[PDB]
Amino acid sequence: PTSILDIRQGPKEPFRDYVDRFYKTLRAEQASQEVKNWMTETLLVQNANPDCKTILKALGPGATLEEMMTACQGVGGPGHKARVL
Amino acid sequence: PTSILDIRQGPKEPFRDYVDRFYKTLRAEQASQEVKNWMTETLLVQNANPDCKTILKALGPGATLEEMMTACQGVGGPGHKARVL
Amino acid sequence: PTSILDIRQGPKEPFRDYVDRFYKTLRAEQASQEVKNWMTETLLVQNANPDCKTILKALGPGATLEEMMTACQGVGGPGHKARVL
Amino acid sequence: PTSILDIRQGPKEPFRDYVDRFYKTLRAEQASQEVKNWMTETLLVQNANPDCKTILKALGPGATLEEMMTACQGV
Protein backbone atom coordinates (compact mmCIF):
# COMPACT_ATOMS: atom_id res chain seq x y z
CA PRO A 1 0.00 0.00 0.00
CA THR A 2 1.81 3.11 -1.29
CA SER A 3 1.55 6.13 1.03
CA ILE A 4 1.44 9.72 -0.19
CA LEU A 5 4.57 10.11 1.95
CA ASP A 6 6.37 7.75 -0.45
CA ILE A 7 5.77 10.02 -3.47
CA ARG A 8 8.93 12.03 -4.06
CA GLN A 9 9.97 13.82 -7.23
CA GLY A 10 12.70 11.88 -9.03
CA PRO A 11 16.15 13.46 -9.55
CA LYS A 12 15.31 14.40 -13.14
CA GLU A 13 11.56 13.79 -13.15
CA PRO A 14 9.53 16.59 -14.74
CA PHE A 15 7.50 18.38 -12.07
CA ARG A 16 4.30 17.79 -14.04
CA ASP A 17 4.88 14.03 -13.90
CA TYR A 18 5.59 14.11 -10.17
CA VAL A 19 2.39 16.10 -9.70
CA ASP A 20 0.42 13.43 -11.57
CA ARG A 21 1.86 10.69 -9.35
CA PHE A 22 1.30 12.72 -6.21
CA TYR A 23 -2.34 13.44 -6.97
CA LYS A 24 -3.03 9.86 -8.04
CA THR A 25 -1.82 8.69 -4.66
CA LEU A 26 -3.57 11.55 -2.86
CA ARG A 27 -6.90 10.52 -4.35
CA ALA A 28 -6.42 7.13 -2.69
CA GLU A 29 -5.12 8.49 0.63
CA GLN A 30 -7.40 8.14 3.65
CA ALA A 31 -7.20 11.57 5.22
CA SER A 32 -9.52 14.43 6.12
CA GLN A 33 -9.86 17.37 3.76
CA GLU A 34 -7.83 19.52 6.14
CA VAL A 35 -4.98 17.01 6.07
CA LYS A 36 -5.20 16.70 2.29
CA ASN A 37 -4.94 20.49 2.07
CA TRP A 38 -1.73 20.28 4.10
CA MET A 39 -0.57 17.57 1.72
CA THR A 40 -1.13 19.67 -1.41
CA GLU A 41 0.14 22.95 0.08
CA THR A 42 3.09 21.68 2.06
CA LEU A 43 3.95 18.02 1.42
CA LEU A 44 3.96 18.44 -2.38
CA VAL A 45 6.59 21.16 -2.05
CA GLN A 46 8.64 19.35 0.58
CA ASN A 47 8.83 16.17 -1.53
CA ALA A 48 9.89 18.02 -4.69
CA ASN A 49 13.49 17.48 -5.78
CA PRO A 50 16.17 20.01 -4.85
CA ASP A 51 16.01 21.73 -8.26
CA CYS A 52 12.26 22.38 -8.12
CA LYS A 53 11.95 22.79 -4.34
CA THR A 54 14.27 25.80 -4.25
CA ILE A 55 12.19 27.44 -6.98
CA LEU A 56 8.93 26.69 -5.22
CA LYS A 57 10.07 28.01 -1.83
CA ALA A 58 11.00 31.35 -3.40
CA LEU A 59 7.42 31.72 -4.65
CA GLY A 60 6.42 32.00 -1.00
CA PRO A 61 3.25 30.70 0.68
CA GLY A 62 -0.08 30.36 -1.10
CA ALA A 63 1.09 29.65 -4.65
CA THR A 64 -1.54 27.78 -6.68
CA LEU A 65 -0.72 24.41 -8.21
CA GLU A 66 -0.77 26.18 -11.59
CA GLU A 67 1.81 28.68 -10.35
CA MET A 68 4.01 25.88 -9.05
CA MET A 69 3.76 24.00 -12.34
CA THR A 70 4.66 27.15 -14.31
CA ALA A 71 7.59 27.81 -11.99
CA CYS A 72 9.17 24.37 -12.40
CA GLN A 73 8.13 23.71 -16.00
CA GLY A 74 11.52 24.72 -17.36
CA VAL A 75 13.72 22.64 -15.06
CA GLY A 76 16.18 20.56 -17.07
CA GLY A 77 15.39 22.66 -20.12
CA PRO A 78 17.73 24.87 -22.09
CA GLY A 79 16.42 28.09 -20.55
CA HIS A 80 17.21 26.64 -17.14
CA LYS A 81 20.68 25.38 -18.10
CA ALA A 82 21.53 28.69 -19.74
CA ARG A 83 20.48 30.85 -16.77
CA VAL A 84 22.87 29.01 -14.43
CA LEU A 85 25.64 29.24 -14.90
CA PRO B 1 14.31 24.93 9.77
CA THR B 2 14.14 21.13 10.10
CA SER B 3 10.80 19.78 8.91
CA ILE B 4 8.96 17.11 10.89
CA LEU B 5 9.09 15.22 7.59
CA ASP B 6 12.86 14.88 7.99
CA ILE B 7 12.88 13.34 11.49
CA ARG B 8 13.77 9.72 10.73
CA GLN B 9 14.80 6.95 13.14
CA GLY B 10 18.47 6.12 12.70
CA PRO B 11 19.42 2.51 11.92
CA LYS B 12 20.58 1.84 15.51
CA GLU B 13 18.63 4.60 17.25
CA PRO B 14 16.44 3.50 20.18
CA PHE B 15 12.77 4.06 19.27
CA ARG B 16 12.22 6.09 22.45
CA ASP B 17 15.00 8.47 21.39
CA TYR B 18 13.47 8.89 17.94
CA VAL B 19 10.05 9.50 19.47
CA ASP B 20 11.53 12.27 21.61
CA ARG B 21 13.14 13.89 18.56
CA PHE B 22 9.89 13.51 16.63
CA TYR B 23 7.76 15.19 19.28
CA LYS B 24 10.33 17.97 19.80
CA THR B 25 10.04 18.95 16.14
CA LEU B 26 6.28 18.35 16.07
CA ARG B 27 5.82 20.91 18.84
CA ALA B 28 7.65 23.45 16.67
CA GLU B 29 5.84 22.54 13.45
CA GLN B 30 3.30 25.10 12.30
CA ALA B 31 0.34 22.98 11.28
CA SER B 32 -3.16 22.63 12.67
CA GLN B 33 -3.94 20.27 15.54
CA GLU B 34 -5.72 17.98 13.11
CA VAL B 35 -2.64 17.78 10.89
CA LYS B 36 -0.35 17.15 13.89
CA ASN B 37 -2.70 14.36 14.98
CA TRP B 38 -2.35 12.78 11.53
CA MET B 39 1.42 13.16 11.85
CA THR B 40 1.40 11.08 15.05
CA GLU B 41 -0.92 8.53 13.39
CA THR B 42 0.97 8.07 10.17
CA LEU B 43 4.21 10.04 9.80
CA LEU B 44 5.64 8.71 13.07
CA VAL B 45 5.32 5.16 11.74
CA GLN B 46 6.45 6.04 8.20
CA ASN B 47 9.72 7.52 9.46
CA ALA B 48 10.68 4.63 11.78
CA ASN B 49 13.66 2.48 10.73
CA PRO B 50 13.18 -0.83 8.86
CA ASP B 51 13.45 -3.02 11.98
CA CYS B 52 10.82 -0.94 13.81
CA LYS B 53 8.44 0.15 11.00
CA THR B 54 7.45 -3.45 10.19
CA ILE B 55 6.77 -4.11 13.87
CA LEU B 56 4.63 -0.99 14.33
CA LYS B 57 2.49 -1.66 11.26
CA ALA B 58 1.85 -5.20 12.48
CA LEU B 59 0.34 -3.86 15.72
CA GLY B 60 -2.75 -2.69 13.94
CA PRO B 61 -4.42 0.63 14.53
CA GLY B 62 -4.61 2.64 17.73
CA ALA B 63 -1.47 1.50 19.52
CA THR B 64 -0.69 3.93 22.34
CA LEU B 65 2.67 5.67 22.22
CA GLU B 66 3.85 3.50 25.12
CA GLU B 67 2.71 0.32 23.35
CA MET B 68 4.69 1.41 20.29
CA MET B 69 7.55 2.34 22.61
CA THR B 70 7.22 -1.16 24.12
CA ALA B 71 7.00 -2.97 20.77
CA CYS B 72 10.19 -1.33 19.51
CA GLN B 73 12.07 -1.03 22.83
CA GLY B 74 15.27 -3.00 22.34
CA VAL B 75 17.92 -4.02 24.88
CA GLY B 76 15.33 -2.56 27.18
CA GLY B 77 13.04 -2.81 28.69
CA PRO B 78 11.38 0.44 29.72
CA GLY B 79 13.95 3.10 30.56
CA HIS B 80 13.59 6.48 32.26
CA LYS B 81 15.42 9.67 31.29
CA ALA B 82 15.86 12.84 33.32
CA ARG B 83 14.31 15.98 31.88
CA VAL B 84 16.80 18.28 30.19
CA LEU B 85 16.72 22.01 31.02
CA PRO C 1 27.68 -0.29 15.46
CA THR C 2 26.41 -0.09 11.89
CA SER C 3 26.58 -2.93 9.39
CA ILE C 4 26.91 -2.18 5.68
CA LEU C 5 23.40 -3.67 5.56
CA ASP C 6 22.23 -0.69 7.64
CA ILE C 7 23.45 1.90 5.13
CA ARG C 8 20.41 3.02 3.11
CA GLN C 9 20.00 6.24 1.13
CA GLY C 10 17.62 8.65 2.81
CA PRO C 11 14.57 9.85 0.86
CA LYS C 12 16.21 13.31 0.40
CA GLU C 13 19.82 12.23 0.86
CA PRO C 14 22.04 13.16 -2.08
CA PHE C 15 23.30 9.99 -3.74
CA ARG C 16 26.87 11.23 -3.37
CA ASP C 17 26.44 11.45 0.41
CA TYR C 18 24.97 7.96 0.51
CA VAL C 19 27.86 6.57 -1.54
CA ASP C 20 30.28 8.22 0.89
CA ARG C 21 28.55 6.62 3.89
CA PHE C 22 28.40 3.28 2.09
CA TYR C 23 32.12 3.20 1.23
CA LYS C 24 33.12 4.36 4.71
CA THR C 25 31.26 1.39 6.17
CA LEU C 26 32.46 -0.89 3.36
CA ARG C 27 36.13 -0.22 4.12
CA ALA C 28 35.45 -1.39 7.69
CA GLU C 29 33.31 -4.41 6.78
CA GLN C 30 34.90 -7.78 7.42
CA ALA C 31 34.02 -9.72 4.29
CA SER C 32 36.10 -11.24 1.49
CA GLN C 33 37.00 -9.15 -1.54
CA GLU C 34 34.50 -11.14 -3.60
CA VAL C 35 31.72 -10.35 -1.16
CA LYS C 36 32.71 -6.67 -1.07
CA ASN C 37 32.64 -6.67 -4.87
CA TRP C 38 29.07 -7.96 -4.66
CA MET C 39 28.30 -5.23 -2.15
CA THR C 40 29.26 -2.49 -4.62
CA GLU C 41 27.64 -4.35 -7.54
CA THR C 42 24.33 -5.16 -5.95
CA LEU C 43 23.91 -3.96 -2.37
CA LEU C 44 24.77 -0.32 -3.21
CA VAL C 45 21.93 -0.33 -5.76
CA GLN C 46 19.48 -2.26 -3.60
CA ASN C 47 19.88 0.15 -0.69
CA ALA C 48 19.49 3.31 -2.76
CA ASN C 49 16.18 5.10 -2.21
CA PRO C 50 13.28 3.78 -4.29
CA ASP C 51 13.35 6.48 -6.95
CA CYS C 52 17.12 6.28 -7.43
CA LYS C 53 17.13 2.47 -7.27
CA THR C 54 14.74 2.24 -10.23
CA ILE C 55 16.99 4.58 -12.20
CA LEU C 56 20.16 2.65 -11.30
CA LYS C 57 18.69 -0.72 -12.25
CA ALA C 58 17.64 0.64 -15.65
CA LEU C 59 21.29 1.54 -16.39
CA GLY C 60 22.14 -2.10 -16.93
CA PRO C 61 25.30 -3.78 -15.62
CA GLY C 62 28.69 -2.22 -15.04
CA ALA C 63 27.87 1.43 -14.52
CA THR C 64 30.70 3.44 -12.94
CA LEU C 65 30.15 5.20 -9.61
CA GLU C 66 30.31 8.46 -11.56
CA GLU C 67 27.62 7.22 -13.95
CA MET C 68 25.51 6.20 -10.95
CA MET C 69 25.94 9.63 -9.31
CA THR C 70 25.02 11.45 -12.51
CA ALA C 71 21.94 9.27 -12.90
CA CYS C 72 20.68 10.02 -9.39
CA GLN C 73 21.45 13.75 -9.40
CA GLY C 74 19.59 16.74 -10.79
CA VAL C 75 20.64 19.33 -13.37
CA GLY C 76 23.40 20.99 -11.37
CA GLY C 77 24.61 18.69 -10.36
CA PRO C 78 27.83 17.49 -8.83
CA GLY C 79 28.47 19.12 -5.45
CA HIS C 80 31.90 19.36 -3.82
CA LYS C 81 32.94 18.73 -0.23
CA ALA C 82 36.13 19.31 1.69
CA ARG C 83 37.99 16.23 2.87
CA VAL C 84 37.13 15.43 6.46
CA LEU C 85 39.89 15.90 9.09
CA PRO D 1 12.33 -11.02 -8.55
CA THR D 2 11.99 -10.13 -4.88
CA SER D 3 15.39 -9.54 -3.31
CA ILE D 4 16.86 -11.70 -0.56
CA LEU D 5 17.57 -8.30 1.04
CA ASP D 6 13.84 -7.88 1.59
CA ILE D 7 13.13 -11.18 3.34
CA ARG D 8 12.59 -10.09 6.95
CA GLN D 9 11.22 -12.09 9.87
CA GLY D 10 7.82 -10.85 11.01
CA PRO D 11 7.39 -9.81 14.64
CA LYS D 12 5.25 -12.89 15.31
CA GLU D 13 6.66 -15.12 12.57
CA PRO D 14 8.19 -18.40 13.76
CA PHE D 15 11.92 -18.34 13.02
CA ARG D 16 11.70 -21.65 11.16
CA ASP D 17 9.12 -20.17 8.78
CA TYR D 18 11.33 -17.16 8.11
CA VAL D 19 14.26 -19.49 7.47
CA ASP D 20 12.13 -21.37 4.92
CA ARG D 21 11.22 -18.16 3.09
CA PHE D 22 14.81 -16.95 3.27
CA TYR D 23 16.21 -20.07 1.65
CA LYS D 24 13.52 -20.21 -1.04
CA THR D 25 14.46 -16.71 -2.13
CA LEU D 26 18.16 -17.51 -1.71
CA ARG D 27 17.92 -20.40 -4.17
CA ALA D 28 16.65 -17.88 -6.76
CA GLU D 29 19.24 -15.24 -5.88
CA GLN D 30 21.85 -14.80 -8.57
CA ALA D 31 25.14 -14.61 -6.73
CA SER D 32 28.14 -16.86 -6.23
CA GLN D 33 28.02 -19.56 -3.55
CA GLU D 34 30.51 -17.57 -1.42
CA VAL D 35 28.16 -14.59 -1.47
CA LYS D 36 25.24 -16.87 -0.68
CA ASN D 37 27.28 -18.25 2.20
CA TRP D 38 27.88 -14.73 3.52
CA MET D 39 24.14 -14.18 3.14
CA THR D 40 23.36 -17.18 5.37
CA GLU D 41 26.04 -16.15 7.90
CA THR D 42 25.19 -12.47 8.09
CA LEU D 43 22.07 -11.40 6.19
CA LEU D 44 19.90 -14.13 7.72
CA VAL D 45 20.80 -12.81 11.19
CA GLN D 46 20.52 -9.16 10.15
CA ASN D 47 16.97 -9.65 8.88
CA ALA D 48 15.64 -11.60 11.86
CA ASN D 49 13.23 -9.74 14.15
CA PRO D 50 14.89 -7.77 16.98
CA ASP D 51 14.56 -10.38 19.78
CA CYS D 52 15.80 -13.17 17.55
CA LYS D 53 18.62 -11.04 16.14
CA THR D 54 19.72 -10.26 19.70
CA ILE D 55 19.73 -13.96 20.56
CA LEU D 56 21.59 -14.96 17.40
CA LYS D 57 24.24 -12.29 17.87
CA ALA D 58 24.83 -13.62 21.38
CA LEU D 59 25.38 -17.11 19.95
CA GLY D 60 28.52 -15.80 18.28
CA PRO D 61 29.99 -16.62 14.88
CA GLY D 62 29.77 -20.06 13.30
CA ALA D 63 26.51 -21.33 14.77
CA THR D 64 24.82 -24.05 12.73
CA LEU D 65 21.39 -23.43 11.26
CA GLU D 66 19.88 -25.81 13.82
CA GLU D 67 21.61 -23.96 16.66
CA MET D 68 19.97 -20.78 15.35
CA MET D 69 16.57 -22.40 15.10
CA THR D 70 16.79 -23.77 18.65
CA ALA D 71 17.92 -20.34 19.84
CA CYS D 72 14.95 -18.51 18.32
CA GLN D 73 12.29 -21.21 18.68
CA GLY D 74 9.06 -20.16 20.35
CA VAL D 75 7.13 -21.79 23.18
Side-chain angles (χ1 to χ4, degrees), chain D:
Chain D
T2 140
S3 182
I4 189 65
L5 291 167
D6 292 313
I7 302 302
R8 301 203 84 115
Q9 188 189 11
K12 309 297 195 295
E13 184 180 17
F15 183 73
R16 298 189 171 89
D17 293 340
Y18 156 68
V19 170
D20 282 339
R21 300 192 295 112
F22 190 90
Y23 275 93
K24 282 198 182 51
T25 298
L26 188 60
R27 282 186 289 276
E29 190 72 14
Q30 284 293 310
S32 71
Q33 188 67 52
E34 171 169 3
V35 169
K36 293 196 176 179
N37 289 346
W38 171 91
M39 288 171 170
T40 54
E41 289 172 356
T42 301
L43 178 59
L44 176 71
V45 176
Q46 161 84 356
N47 280 9
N49 66 32
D51 292 329
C52 182
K53 173 147 59 168
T54 297
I55 287 161
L56 301 178
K57 290 299 219 330
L59 281 187
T64 68
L65 190 52
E66 279 293 346
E67 282 181 295
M68 295 178 80
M69 294 185 294
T70 295
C72 290
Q73 71 184 351
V75 275

Side-chain angles (χ1 to χ4, degrees), chain A residues 18-73:
Chain A
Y18 160 62
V19 165
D20 281 338
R21 299 193 297 113
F22 190 93
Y23 275 86
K24 178 165 180 167
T25 297
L26 180 68
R27 288 187 294 267
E29 190 76 22
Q30 182 164 83
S32 72
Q33 202 63 55
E34 185 172 353
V35 171
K36 290 196 177 183
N37 292 342
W38 177 87
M39 291 172 171
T40 56
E41 291 167 15
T42 300
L43 180 63
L44 176 69
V45 174
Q46 292 295 310
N47 279 12
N49 70 28
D51 291 336
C52 185
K53 184 176 180 187
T54 294
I55 289 177
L56 296 180
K57 288 309 287 199
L59 293 175
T64 69
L65 179 60
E66 288 75 10
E67 289 173 322
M68 301 189 186
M69 294 184 46
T70 297
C72 285
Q73 185 61 34

